[PDB]
Ligand binder design. Structure first.
Ligand SMILES: Nc1ncnc2c1ncn2[C@H]1C[C@H](O)[C@@H](COP(=O)(O)OP(=O)(O)OP(=O)(O)O)O1
Ligand SMILES: [Ca+2]
Length: 430
DNA sequence: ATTTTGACGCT
DNA sequence: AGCGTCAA
């Protein structure tokens, strides 16, 4: 009752760029705009592996992970843009720089947590309070929410997409209580107004479109964001949670898309997030551990307490290359050459990072996969990163991994290496 | 033969 | 530390 927390204390948004790498390439090359297209890495093997797909191409069934030759079977007119290759490997610099463009715009509005290259969480609580004081009881017009969906609406007593959106927005605003500056629903609505403004600024200043979710915590904001892509935003209110969760597969909730979510389904014999409400906190803790159990107990009721972390820059800078099938590195000299290529890219990015962000990495992490091991990483070792020097970093990585080689003749490498990974970590101010 | 990335938890 | 999970 009067002491039961409802997790309505914050306004949190999750901005997710639409088909991001595709949009970067379409901005650069207008011939690709409004076409079925995709972004591919490499080209020799089966036309290259697709890593991003425009919505026009998705309509044909083109997906990520697909080989371009196979995506051409579904979409013969598919256009392609290739990731730049440098030093013998794919180089993602263009997309990292476009990400900085968007993150810097978002940072003008609020503190952001960079979740990935094209996703950021925004804590809008303070900005919403300020805007509510400015509005000073004035109602919120539907014109201020031109691309917003209210999840769950319309309901109760037009066959067009936009018609449904406006019809739902009207019901929401009609019911909204603008008197109460502390009303969580009003706070979310003002949050959505601010996110419309943020998304307009991103599109104006970069050309890039995005989707967004607005709710009371990060998990609901992420879920909301995915409900109406592309180029739309969705408000998930606390009151919308029971219906929304009643048919929501557990795997759709962030962190439950893998083994833990599978175990929740198998152990409890349920399918949907809402069914979790029927277990006590101690029951969930008994099956999934103290932390996961408490998290699930609150999350299935719409309550998540994870903060939006004040962090705009990545905490690590890494470079990796796979060596699949017969191309696995089987000689020592070969291993050293690829470590040098990786270390040269890493040096370049680290030097730029140091100049831009006033920080220095202090640890180098070296990871490898051996041919036959199914695990993503077979071995991980660290050494000091004391100089931004590609020859030194590559020599040091070799030093830390050279004893993994079983071959009695050093010139040969066995078992063959199927992946090399260098990552700079543990930044200190400089 | 998806590849190339980040962030965070466990012991 | 080194390994594993989950996600762009
Ligand atoms: N598995 C992957 N491997 C390599 N790059 C990836 C992978 N997944 C995503 N990316 C890249 C390319 C994407 O443009 C970018 C953002 O990813 P993601 O948000 O999942 O999809 P997306 O932005 O392309 O489409 P959407 O509109 O559905 O968000 O990160
Ligand atoms: Ca995206």
């Amino acid at each position: 009752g009067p002491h039961m927390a409802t997790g309505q204390d914050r306004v949190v948004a999750l901005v997710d760029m639409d088909c991001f790498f595709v949009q970067v390439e379409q901005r650069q090359n207008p011939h690709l705009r409004n076409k079925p297209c995709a972004v591919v890495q490499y080209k020799s093997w089966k036309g290259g592996g697709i890593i991003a797909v425009s919505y026009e191409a998705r309509a044909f069934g083109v997906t990520r992970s697909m080989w371009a030759d196979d995506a051409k079977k579904l979409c013969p007119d598919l256009l392609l843009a290739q990731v730049r290759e440098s030093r013998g490997k794919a180089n993602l610099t263009k997309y990292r720089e476009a990400s900085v463009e968007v993150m810097e715009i978002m940072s003008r509005f609020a503190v952001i947590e960079r979740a990935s290259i094209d996703e950021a969480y925004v804590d809008l609580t303070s900005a919403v309070q300020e805007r509510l004081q400015k509005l000073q009881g004035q109602p919120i017009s539907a014109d201020l929410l031109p691309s917003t969906y209210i999840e769950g609406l319309p309901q109760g007593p037009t066959v067009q997409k936009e018609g449904m959106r406006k019809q739902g927005l009207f019901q929401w605003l009609d019911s909204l209580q603008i008197d109460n500056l502390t009303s969580p629903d009003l706070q979310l609505t003002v949050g959505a107004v601010i996110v419309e403004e943020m998304r307009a600024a991103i599109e104006r200043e970069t050309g890039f479109q995005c989707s967004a979710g607005i709710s009371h915590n990060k998990v609901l904001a992420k879920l909301a964001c995915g409900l109406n892509k592309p180029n739309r935003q969705t408000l998930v209110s606390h009151g919308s949670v029971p219906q929304l969760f009643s048919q929501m597969p557990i795997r759709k909730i962030r962190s439950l898309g893998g083994k833990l979510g599978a175990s929740v389904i198998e152990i409890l014999g349920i399918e949907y997030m809402g069914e979790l409400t029927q277990f006590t906190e101690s029951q969930l803790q008994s099956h999934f551990g103290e932390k996961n159990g408490s998290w699930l107990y609150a999350m299935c009721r719409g309550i998540e307490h994870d903060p939006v972390k004040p962090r705009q820059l990545p905490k690590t800078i890494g470079c990796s290359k796979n060596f699949p099938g017969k191309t696995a590195l089987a000689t020592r000299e070969q291993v050293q050459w690829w470590l040098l290529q990786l270390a040269q890219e890493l040096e370049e990015r680290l030097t730029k990072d140091r100049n831009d962000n006033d920080r220095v990495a202090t640890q180098l992490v070296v990871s490898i996969r051996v041919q036959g091991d199914k695990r993503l990483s077979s071995l991980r070792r660290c050494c000091a990163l004391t100089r931004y020097d590609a020859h030194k970093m590559s020599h040091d990585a070799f030093t830390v991994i050279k004893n993994c080689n079983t071959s009695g003749i050093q010139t040969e490498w066995s078992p063959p290496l199927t992946m090399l990974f260098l990552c700079a970590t543990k930044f200190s101010a400089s």
